[PDB]
A paper describes a structure:
Consistent with the docking screening, replacement of the morpholino moiety in SF2523 with the piperazine moiety in [name] led to a substantial, ~ 40-fold increase in selectivity toward BRD4BD1 over BRD4BD2 compared to a ~ sixfold selectivity of the parent compound SF2523. The IC50 measurements showed that adding the piperazine substituent does not significantly alter inhibition of BRD4BD1 but substantially decreases inhibition of BRD4BD2. In all complexes, the thienopyranone moiety inserts deeply in the binding pocket laying parallel to the α-helices of BRD4BD1, whereas the benzodioxane moiety of SRX3212, SRX3212P and [name] is oriented toward the ZA loop of BRD4BD1. The carbonyl oxygen in the thienopyranone moiety of all compounds forms a hydrogen bond with the amide nitrogen of Asn140 and a water-mediated hydrogen bond with the hydroxyl group of Tyr97 of BRD4BD1. While the nitrogen atom in the piperazine ring of SRX3212P and [name] is unrestrained, the oxygen atom in the morpholine ring of SRX3212 is involved in a water mediated polar interaction with the carboxyl group of Asp144, which likely accounts for a sevenfold increase in potency of SRX3212 compared to SRX3212P. Although the hydrogen bond between the side chain amide of Gln85 and the dioxane moiety of the thienopyranone scaffold is conserved, restraining SRX3212, SRX3212P and [name], the presence of the pyrid-3-ylmethylaminocarbonyl benzodioxane moiety in SRX3212 and SRX3212P altered the hydrophobic contacts with Trp81. The indole ring of Trp81 flips over ~ 180° in SRX3212 and SRX3212P compared to this ring’s position in [name], enhancing its interaction with the benzodioxane moiety. However, [name] induced CSPs in the fast exchange regime indicative of a weak interaction in the micromolar range (right). In support of IC50 values, the NMR titration data demonstrate that while adding the pyrid-3-ylmethylaminocarbonyl substituent causes a moderate increase in selectivity toward BRD4BD1, the piperazine substituent appears to be the major driving force of the selectivity. The ability of piperazine-containing compounds SRX3212P and [name] to associate and inhibit PI3Kα was also decreased as measured by kinase screening assays.
[name] contains two bromodomains, BRD4BD1 and BRD4BD2, that recognize acetylated lysine residues in histones and non-histone proteins. Of the four members of the [name] family proteins, [name] is the most thoroughly characterized, and its aberrant activity has been associated with NUT midline carcinoma, colon, breast and prostate cancers, neuroblastoma, and hematopoietic cancers. [name] overexpression has been shown to promote tumor growth by stimulating transcription of major oncogenic drivers, such as MYC. In this study, we report the biological activities and mechanisms of action of thienopyranone (TP)-based inhibitors with increased potency toward [name] and selectivity toward BRD4BD1.
Numbering used by the authors: 44 to 167
The structure:
Amino acid sequence: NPPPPETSNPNKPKRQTNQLQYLLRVVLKTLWKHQFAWPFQQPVDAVKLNLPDYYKIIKTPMDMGTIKKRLENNYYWNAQECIQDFNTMFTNCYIYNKPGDDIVLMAEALEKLFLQKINELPTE
Ligand SMILES: O=c1cc(N2CCNCC2)oc2c(-c3ccc4c(c3)OCCO4)csc12
């Protein structure tokens, strides 16, 4: 298992927006309490889950805890960059698993909830 994705960067700037703020306090919290959050609340432990070549196939591991700690650190550039990390998290799951499997069903239920929540987002 590689190190978890970065949460800070010295060469990268920091800002917050009313949208990012909505992503943390509303979107991320909504998903975080979803029934199916827990496989995604922390980086995938490919070792202990026995995922073959997980980190060869998945070149951008993403997870809601990395998202979370990024949002609290205002690591992100804008709401766009944060949504994309969410999108990466679901996509990673559809790339690595057979369509129809439990985990994919779970990512799909989180994604649909995610989608409805991102419509509540204002444009800055
Ligand atoms: O793409 C993934 C592939 C699967 N599998 C596990 C079972 N064989 C089929 C492939 O597992 C995950 C997880 C995950 C699942 C269960 C967890 C978990 C993470 O962490 C806490 C303990 O239970 C996040 S993505 C992802």
